[PDB]
Amino acid sequence: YELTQPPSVSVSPGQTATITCSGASTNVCWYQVKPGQSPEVVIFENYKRPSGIPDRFSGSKSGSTATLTIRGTQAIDEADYYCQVWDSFSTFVFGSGTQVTVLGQPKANPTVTLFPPATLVCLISDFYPGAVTVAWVETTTPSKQSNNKYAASSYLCQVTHEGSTVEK
């Protein structure tokens, strides 16, 4: 028994966003988590909403797929969303998780730097879409810089970016 979600959804500010789940036989409830914050429910049934949650979130289930739509995404609610379905054997089955991010600054190309040693190291910096892949090992989760950008490092190279590749 598996529940499948898209890994990432990226939208512009002022644009709606959609998250779909699959493989659900009963009612699905959605949780929103934040880095360093406790989870909270935003849609506690297929369509219902709890008190205190604004009306930007709306969900609907059709067959075996339950979708959650955010109307007018902002700099707020840049977060990870999970789903939950009750099952008979395992009491609660959770989804893989969908990351919702917004583009409040335009795209920038990363800068790579490789250093010969026997440890080979590549340093990547200054890129706003954080989803980057490195090929040639240990790689980092791309964390935020001081100037609202991202950096990463590799240890042992080519890097793949959205519409680009840089090999050194």
Partner 1 sequence: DNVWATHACVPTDPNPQEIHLENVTEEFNMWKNNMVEQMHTDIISLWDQSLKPCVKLTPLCVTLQCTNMRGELKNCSFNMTTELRDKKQKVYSLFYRLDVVQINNKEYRLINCNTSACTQACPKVSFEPIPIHYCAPAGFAILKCKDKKFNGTGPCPSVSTVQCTHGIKPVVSTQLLLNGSLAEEEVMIRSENITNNAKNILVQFNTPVQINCTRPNNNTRKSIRIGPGQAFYATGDIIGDIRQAHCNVSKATWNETLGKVVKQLRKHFGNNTIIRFANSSGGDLEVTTHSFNCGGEFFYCNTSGLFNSTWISNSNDSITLPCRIKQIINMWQRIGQCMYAPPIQGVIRCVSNITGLILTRDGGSTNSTTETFRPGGGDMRDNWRSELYKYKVVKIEPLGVAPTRCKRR
Partner 2 sequence: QVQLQESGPGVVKSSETLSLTCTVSGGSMGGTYWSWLRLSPGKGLEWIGYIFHTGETNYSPSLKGRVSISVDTSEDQFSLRLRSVTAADTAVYFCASLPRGQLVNAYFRNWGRGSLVSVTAASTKGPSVFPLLGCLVKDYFPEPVTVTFPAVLQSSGLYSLSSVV
Ligand X SMILES: *[C@@H]1O[C@H](CO)[C@@H](O[C@@H]2O[C@H](CO)[C@@H](O[C@@H]3O[C@H](CO)[C@@H](O)[C@H](O)[C@@H]3O)[C@H](O)[C@H]2NC(C)=O)[C@H](O)[C@H]1NC(C)=O
Instruction: Give contact residues for partner 1 (rule: CB under 8 A).
Output: 26-27, 45-47, 61, 86, 91
Closest contact distance (angstroms) between CB of 83 and partner 1 is 14
- The answer to whether 147 contacts ligand X (rule: CB under 6 A) is no
In sequence order, what are the residues at sequence separation of 6 or more whose Cβ sits closer than 8 angstroms to the Cβ of residue 120?
114, 155, 156, 157
- Of 86 and 128, CB closest to ligand X: 86
Q: Give residue 43's identity as a one-letter amino acid code.
A: I
**Residue 45 or 77: which CB sits closer to partner 2?**
45
Residue 90 C-beta: closest distance to ligand X, Å:
9
* # residues near ligand X by CB under 6 A: 2
Contact between 88 and ligand X per CB under 6 A: yes
Residues that bind partner 2 (CB under 8 A): 26-27, 29, 31, 33, 38-41, 44-45, 82, 84, 86, 89-92, 94-97, 113, 115-117, 119, 121, 123, 138, 140-141, 143, 151, 153, 155
Contact 29, 84 (CB under 8 A): yes
What stretches of 6-146 adopt beta strand conformation (E)?
8-11, 17-20, 28-34, 37-43, 57-62, 65-70, 79-86, 92-94, 98-102, 111-115, 121-127, 133-135, 138-139, 143-144
Query: In angstroms, what is the minimal distance from the CB of 46 to partner 1?
Result: 4
State which of residues 7, 35, 36, 89 lies at the interface with ligand X (CB under 6 A).
89
- Spatial CB neighbours of 102, under 8 Å, sequence gap ≥ 6: 10, 11, 12, 13, 73, 74, 75, 78
